[PDB]
């Protein structure tokens, strides 16, 4: 109970969050989080969204999250294959197009945008905190 999260991460709720250092395309951002035994940000509730919007209010830049879609006939899914809960947010940006490497979502000034996954952006990683979960 004394060390929920490592240094340089942010503890919130049952998880730890990391501003990853690099600016990379979505696939490389995914690999970076996985290399840390973590995953790209998964917004699971309105409380999570509120937390992230507050946590990024010091920055105007985009941050990749773990949401992607091969083309518009597929659902938006998190990396674990679960869907975007429809009450959380409405993806803006490049929602009609199809790109060779897929479309991915980032958050920027609290709003969520679709973009060609080849864009280099910052990303947020998360992992479970070292505590006894409910």
Contacts of 51 (CB under 8 A, 6+ apart): 12, 13
Q: Please give the DSSP secondary-structure letter assigned to residue 76.
A: P
Binds 73: which of a second copy, Ni ion, none (CB < 5-8 Å by kind): none
Site string for a second copy, 42-71 (x = CB under 8 A): ---------x--xxxxxxxx-x--------
User: What is each CA distance from 17 to 9, 75, 102, in whole angstroms?
Assistant: 5, 25, 25
Told to check if 1 binds Ni ion by CB under 5 A, we report yes
Return the residues of window 103-132 that contact a second copy according to CB under 8 A.
122
Beta bridge partners of 16: 11, 127
Of 112, 59, 56, nearest to 84 by C-alpha is: 112
Regarding 20 and contact with a second copy (CB under 8 A), the answer is yes
| Interacting partner of 54 out of Ni ion, a second copy, none (Cβ under 5 to 8 A depending on kind) | a second copy
| Cα–Cα dist 5/10, whole Å | 7
Using the minimum distance from each CB to a second copy, give the nearer residue, 35 or 59: 59
Contact status: 134 vs Ni ion (CB under 5 A): no
Supply φ then ψ for residue 58, to 5 degrees. -80, -5
Residue 81's binding partner among a second copy, Ni ion, none (Cβ under 5 to 8 angstroms by kind) is none
Nearest to 22 by CA among 113, 112, 124, 116: 124
| Partner from a second copy, Ni ion, none binding residue 57, C-beta < 5-8 Å depending on class | a second copy
- The residues binding Ni ion (CB under 5 A) are 1-2
Q: Where do contacts with a second copy occur on this chain (CB under 8 A)?
A: 1-13, 19-22, 51, 54-61, 63, 122, 133-134
């Amino acid at each position: 109970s004394h060390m929920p999260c490592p240094q340089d991460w942010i503890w919130h709720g049952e998880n730890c969050y990391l501003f990853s250092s690099g600016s990379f395309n979505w696939e490389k951002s995914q690999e970076k989080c996985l290399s840390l035994d973590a995953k790209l940000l998964k917004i699971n509730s309105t409380a999570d969204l509120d937390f992230i919007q507050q946590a990024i209010s010091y920055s105007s830049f985009p941050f990749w999250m773990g949401l992607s879609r091969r083309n518009p006939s597929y659902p938006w899914l998190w990396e674990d294959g679960s869907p975007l809960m429809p009450h959380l947010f409405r993806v803006r940006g490049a929602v009609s197009q199809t790109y060779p490497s897929g479309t991915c979502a980032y958050i920027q000034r609290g709003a969520v945008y679709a973009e060609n996954c080849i864009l280099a952006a910052f990303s947020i990683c998360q992992k479970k905190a070292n505590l006894r979960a409910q």
